[PDB]
């Protein structure tokens, strides 16, 4: 599992239960193609987006869908997703968990770097 | 103003100064168009972006240049840029201070939105 | 002023306003001894805590009573409060801004230091 | 597992691996007494501070050692240490995870309460 994703949620004090998940990778022509997407688990957990060998060095961003998550709580949220952009880097530490706190007018987010 | 933005160091307990600021809206072809920019002064802030009048209802992206930030203290960072997309105006006219906190693999950010 | 505390309401996209703040110094009997207090404003700023004299070398506590805070809110946070444990001035006088972002289950804190 | 502590490095985006932790538990005379303490292992985890028996209600200090995590790495820190201060209830979730993300003048700290 060279890419992970955590969200959890600081209003409620629990895993951010199915959030809709995409992640991008920046092509040539500076746009950004899907490269994997999802919903996070009961732990607030998203695993196997992708492969060691598809995972190569690049630009990539993770989109949460923070907003809908919000609504379905019915809470007025402020942000439209939250967006994590990053390069992947083959010289250091191959394994990367990306992990979101949520609230609905704050995020927060770490990268957890690994081998 | 009606749109500030604040960013802090978490490393050097400081107001992180000299951070390059650009704000887009979303176009009616959902494009981003680019509404305004600046770089934050000693002080952390930003100021003078754009106006009431100007600030219409909207998607607007905050993009903070975190890695030009990092990389002029020796610093390799995580993220490419904090990026911060909010729908702006759309129940009237409000104060926006867009606030970060940064680190080198990781930023906290808020919104305080205040009715004049 | 040389200390200033600034809290913030990461679910209301606001200025936590009338929080109460105690700020504590350890003695040379190594207990905690009450040094100021005050609440927030309205901008969620709280100052003249103390003054350059008064605030010598020393290590400091500042609890922000956020469980009050959420509970007049209507919510049942998870902590009792947030709690700031640092040293101050022992290089010189300094001016610290310590600034703390509230949500029911999580909290965030950080230092601004200058030097005037 | 009753409580768990996680712990994380905004700086060099890795676990704080050896990070001492001070678990308190108030006494009826409001005072501190220590409950329980270790050090976070290689993933910046410690776990089995407790068990379900001894971890009955209460309110809890959980005291992380920052301040001596900082100057190991050469790196001049704010605070004295983190603390996190906080209420056991047994009829909510019963499963605790604190989780703090340290930097060098500033932390973040959540609850992740669970069933
Ligand atoms: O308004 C001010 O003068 C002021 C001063 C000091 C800190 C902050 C905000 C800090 C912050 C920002 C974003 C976060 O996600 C978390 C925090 Cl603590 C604002
Ligand atoms: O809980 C876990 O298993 C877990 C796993 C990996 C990363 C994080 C980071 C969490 C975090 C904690 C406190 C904050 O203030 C902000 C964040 Cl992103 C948490």
Same mark, same amino acid.
């Given at each position: 599992?060279?890419?992970?994703?955590?969200?959890?949620? &600081?209003?409620?004090?629990?895993?951010?239960?199915?959030?809709?998940?995409?992640?991008?990778?920046?092509?040539?022509?500076?746009?950004? $193609?899907?490269?994997?997407?999802?919903?996070? =688990? #009961?732990?607030? $957990?998203?695993?196997?987006?992708?492969? #060691? #060998? $598809?995972?190569? $060095?690049?630009?990539?961003?993770? #989109?949460?869908?923070? /907003?809908?998550?919000? /609504?379905?709580?019915?809470?007025?949220?402020?942000?439209?997703?939250?967006?994590?952009?990053?390069? &992947?880097?083959? =010289?250091?530490?191959?394994?990367?968990?990306? &992990? &979101?706190?949520?609230?609905?007018?704050?995020?927060?987010?770490?990268?957890?770097?690994?081998?």
């Amino acid at each position: 599992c060279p890419l992970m994703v955590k969200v959890l949620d &600081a209003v409620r004090g629990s895993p951010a239960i199915n959030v809709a998940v995409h992640v991008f990778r920046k092509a040539a022509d500076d746009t950004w $193609e899907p490269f994997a997407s999802g919903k996070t =688990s #009961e732990s607030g $957990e998203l695993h196997g987006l992708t492969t #060691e #060998e $598809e995972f190569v $060095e690049g630009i990539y961003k993770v #989109e949460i869908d923070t /907003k809908s998550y919000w /609504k379905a709580l019915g809470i007025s949220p402020f942000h439209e997703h939250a967006e994590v952009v990053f390069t &992947a880097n083959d =010289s250091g530490p191959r394994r990367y968990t990306i &992990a &979101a706190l949520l609230s609905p007018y704050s995020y927060s987010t770490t990268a957890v770097v690994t081998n």
